[PDB]
Symmetry: C2
Subunit: 322 residues, 2 copies
Amino acid sequence: RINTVRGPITISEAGFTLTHEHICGTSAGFLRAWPEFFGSRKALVEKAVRGLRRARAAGVRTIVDVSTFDIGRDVSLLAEVSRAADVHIVAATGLWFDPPLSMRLRSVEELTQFFLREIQYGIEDTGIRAGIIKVATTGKATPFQELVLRAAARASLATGVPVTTHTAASQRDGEQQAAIFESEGLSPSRVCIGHSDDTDDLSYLTALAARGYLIGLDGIPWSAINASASALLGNRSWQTRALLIKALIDQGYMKQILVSNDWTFGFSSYVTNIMDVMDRVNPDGMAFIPLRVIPFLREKGVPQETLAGITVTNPARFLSPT
Amino acid sequence: DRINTVRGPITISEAGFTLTHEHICGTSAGFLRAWPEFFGSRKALVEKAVRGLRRARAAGVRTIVDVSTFDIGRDVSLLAEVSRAADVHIVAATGLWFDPPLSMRLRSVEELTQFFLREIQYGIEDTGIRAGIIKVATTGKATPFQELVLRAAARASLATGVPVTTHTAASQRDGEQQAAIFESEGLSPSRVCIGHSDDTDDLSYLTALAARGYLIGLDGIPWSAIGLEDNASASALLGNRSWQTRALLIKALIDQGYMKQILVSNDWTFGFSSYVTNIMDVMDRVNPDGMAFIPLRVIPFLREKGVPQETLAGITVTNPARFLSPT
Ligand SMILES: [Co+2]
Ligand SMILES: [Co+2]
Ligand SMILES: [Co+2]
Ligand SMILES: [Co+2]
């Protein structure tokens, strides 16, 4: 009962899934208005097809595109790349930290209708329904960012669809988001505190993992080992971020881990050549988790059925509507 | 002599009575397609727009310049559909207003110049519809990004001959900073309209810009929140100045010899989502005439005050014709 861009699929059809990915990290209407920024729309489709086929050959069967309205989600692009690559792509709703005036002047009740429109009816005029809700917070929650967290909760409770968040982990936003989700009546088993790998703090993660929250260790290839790339991605290495997966397995929270790359095939919501800077830091792309992180954990003393539990059974339990 | 409309190129003589600053929808990038239910439905918005433009046409309007940019949620397909059904020429816009998303605000002046050029020379999105005007904006002192938008607009105008029109916080005298930046790029004042100029009563500011060759946009004549001072949202947007006060600025500029520098419009819309929810209903109640307000209520008002019919015809037909013509 998991909604994808090609239609509804079952829990067994999901397989190896990456919980936090992006085909394109852009802005609302941007891809349609300026496709030449990515070379052409043809070039972005071709680069995304080759990148997903690389992930499929590596073991991945499903990717969850957490690109929201304001990240410039184009479900028609998501459907085209999914068809040519034979990889299941799950679409998303919600609002990130770049909402336009028509979204930021809306009440909590109006934002619930929009989220409920994209999950129950469909996205735009395509009929494609959203299977996950993406929300954001950069530091302490602004008066509007609180309404998005609450609206995402009211939409998750009426459909059963899960929530995934953006967090500035060094500032520990996951505790405030958790306090807001719990005040709304949302079950912690339906929420994923993303970007939790941006910190080396383990005491903040185990506290949330004990309450039932899923920990999103999603930006593993993000290593700044360029003032723009050093501020966006990486103070530490990938080995340090991948050791945080092992540190949570050792504490007995193997059922709460969700791994991903947080990769893109086109990036426009930052500096011009950030995609070219990223493409060489990680030449593996979206295939970094099964080819470089899984054999690392196998060498550092973690069995294959613990890793096959994190990648197959954990995201399938998360993405299933309850 | 030839200008781009959403139905294709037309000869300037066919433009006729032209409203220089209007919107079919005041929204945000991708909003109409992602949430048409905000406006009832996409079909309801089209029907309302067609009815409004048909009524405006019956009153004498032949062309409107939709100054909706990418970030005002310009949907050219909607503009084309309504233009064809109402049989009113609609000139589309490029440029950037004051709500650009991350992918726009992180761009350099060279990249923004290429985006504006693409929308004028090649087309908007995958439609083939080309922009006939560049819309820019400042709300007080220009931010570093707004300065880049103004420079890119000036560069695209110099390369194509297409005019530039602006949004200003008129009380803050924004037109002076805008003018300075445009002229630093070598753009002729005759290719620029300093809009929302009816938001101020400072005639010294207006005549000085007009004296330099700038077109003065007295473009929101029906905007008045008198009678509804209890509505904090409507008062902050529409202001407390009467439609008459805004319209008398057209007479004031004519009297000082600047009839050739005046552009008049309503700054109306059929859908409004970039503000509070009830705003379109409130606006439609204050002004039931919509875009027809200029020929039905403003033109006869100025005739009562003594302005000749040939001067008014010069402001509504000749001035927009000279402005829109690629020069
Ligand atoms: Co993020
Ligand atoms: Co992301
Ligand atoms: Co304006
Ligand atoms: Co306007």
